[PDB]
């Protein structure tokens, strides 16, 4: 049961946003600033003692991105909630010693180009079946060459989410860079597709993330056996999976942005998680 809370009444005959789609045709919320009251959501998730896992891969020179990634996650990611960072790396000694807030912990997990391509999906799936099931409620899987600039919180949490890729949120489906060769397991025809989801930010419950990552891994191994590599690698497979298994929330491009390449459009009230230039 929620406690008494004082907040503005939601107004039925006033839309929350007039400039963007805030719900998908399968009734999944599309998360934009102005659609949620974070105080209500924080209450709901704190009362469940929610723990969020955040996975990141930092292989070879990408260890250089960890310090800013983690420092900014400390400022902006799930603050007030239990967080477990999982840093997958080939260089455990190169992981910076970042000071964490209370209730937050970090684990370092030591890790043919074909095997490198399948690595993230394979390892996330393997670790879902081990550590993650026992340790966290939700998993968030992101790229490391990024920084948090504003709030990323429990508004994203749901059984399965994808994020609108910042390059294609205003594009027609024919222009999406899905895999277009029927010989690939990631194939999507020109007349199908809801959104182009970014491989750099997805997640959900541990069970749903295990299913997604196992399915993507298995599809990639079928492609490898057939001598084909999808145009955008595991992102192509992620898009095929989310076409056939609709996400229960979609995050707006506030949650995955590149200001150098795309500026700061009026439609984005906040830039929350952004590419490092
Ligand atoms: O590299 C990719 N995304 C960036 C993230 O992948 C991780 N990464 C990438 C390169 C690298 O050297 N180290 C590393 O950690 C890091 O977390 C980056 O944020 C995507 C882009 O398509 N990618 C490339 C490939 C790939 C793998 C093997 C062969 C060809 C492509 N798979 N995924
Ligand atoms: C029509 C408008 C034309 C403009 C489109 C501009 C975005 C293109 O984006 C690339 O999209 C690819 C899929 O098609 C992959 O997701 C790739 O990782 C991504 O590059 C990434 O994300 C970008 C945002 C940059 O940060 C880039 O450095 C990344 O490597």
């Amino acid at each position: 049961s929620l406690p008494r809370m004082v907040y503005p009444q939601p107004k039925v005959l006033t839309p929350c946003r007039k400039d963007v789609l805030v719900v998908t045709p399968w009734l999944a919320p599309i998360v934009w600033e102005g659609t949620f009251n974070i105080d209500i959501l924080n209450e709901q998730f704190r009362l469940q003692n929610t723990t969020i896992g955040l996975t990141v891969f930092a292989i070879k020179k990408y260890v250089a991105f960890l310090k800013l990634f983690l420092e900014t996650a400390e400022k902006h990611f799930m603050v007030g909630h239990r967080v477990h960072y999982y840093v997958f790396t080939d260089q455990p000694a190169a992981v910076p010693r970042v000071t964490l807030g209370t209730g937050r912990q970090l684990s370092v997990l030591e890790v043919r180009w074909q095997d490198v391509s399948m690595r993230r999906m394979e390892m996330i799936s393997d670790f879902c079946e081990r550590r993650f099931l026992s340790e966290v409620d939700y998993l968030v899987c992101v790229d490391v060459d990024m920084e948090f600039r504003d709030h990323v919180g429990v508004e994203i949490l749901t059984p399965l989410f994808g994020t609108l890729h910042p390059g294609f949120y205003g594009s027609s489906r024919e222009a999406f860079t899905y895999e277009r060769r029927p010989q690939s397991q990631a194939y999507i025809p020109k007349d199908e597709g809801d959104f182009y989801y970014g491989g750099a930010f997805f997640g959900g419950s541990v069970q749903e993330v295990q299913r997604l990552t196992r399915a993507c891994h298995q599809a990639m191994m079928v492609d490898q056996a057939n001598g084909i590599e999808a145009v955008w690698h595991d992102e192509s497979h992620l898009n095929k999976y989310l076409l056939r298994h609709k996400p229960t929330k979609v995050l707006s491009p506030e949650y995955l942005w590149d200001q150098q390449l795309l500026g700061w459009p009026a439609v984005l009230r906040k830039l929350r998680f952004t590419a490092v230039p």
Side-chain angles (χ1 to χ4, degrees), residues 37-66:
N37 180 320
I38 196 58
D39 299 320
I40 297 170
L41 296 169
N42 275 332
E43 281 283 351
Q44 291 183 130
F45 285 91
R46 275 304 301 149
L47 290 167
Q48 301 179 65
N49 195 214
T50 304
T51 303
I52 306 93
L54 183 60
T55 68
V56 67
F57 289 74
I59 312 302
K60 295 174 187 177
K61 294 184 181 182
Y62 281 67
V63 295
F65 296 106
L66 284 166

Side-chain angles (χ1 to χ4, degrees), residues 32-128:
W32 301 91
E33 185 65 13
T35 63
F36 60 92
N37 180 320
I38 196 58
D39 299 320
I40 297 170
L41 296 169
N42 275 332
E43 281 283 351
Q44 291 183 130
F45 285 91
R46 275 304 301 149
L47 290 167
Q48 301 179 65
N49 195 214
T50 304
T51 303
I52 306 93
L54 183 60
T55 68
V56 67
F57 289 74
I59 312 302
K60 295 174 187 177
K61 294 184 181 182
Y62 281 67
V63 295
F65 296 106
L66 284 166
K67 191 163 176 291
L68 183 65
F69 178 91
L70 293 169
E71 285 169 348
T72 64
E74 284 298 301
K75 295 180 178 290
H76 296 296
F77 181 76
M78 305 292 168
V79 175
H81 299 274
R82 290 179 58 78
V83 171
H84 200 141
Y85 300 103
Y86 298 101
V87 178
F88 292 88
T89 185
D90 60 339
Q91 297 157 80
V95 178
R97 301 184 174 83
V98 174
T99 309
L100 308 185
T102 191
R104 306 172 73 97
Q105 62 179 304
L106 186 144
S107 294
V108 180
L109 309 171
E110 192 169 0
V111 313
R112 294 172 74 267
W113 71 265
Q114 298 96 320
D115 292 319
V116 172
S117 181
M118 296 188 297
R119 184 155 57 183
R120 290 164 91 195
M121 293 298 186
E122 188 185 57
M123 283 202 274
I124 293 161
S125 67
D126 189 49
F127 277 84
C128 288

Side-chain angles (χ1 to χ4, degrees), residues 165-168 177 196 232 235 258 261 275:
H165 192 295
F168 301 97
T177 60
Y196 194 79
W232 290 106
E235 176 174 274
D258 184 328
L261 277 190

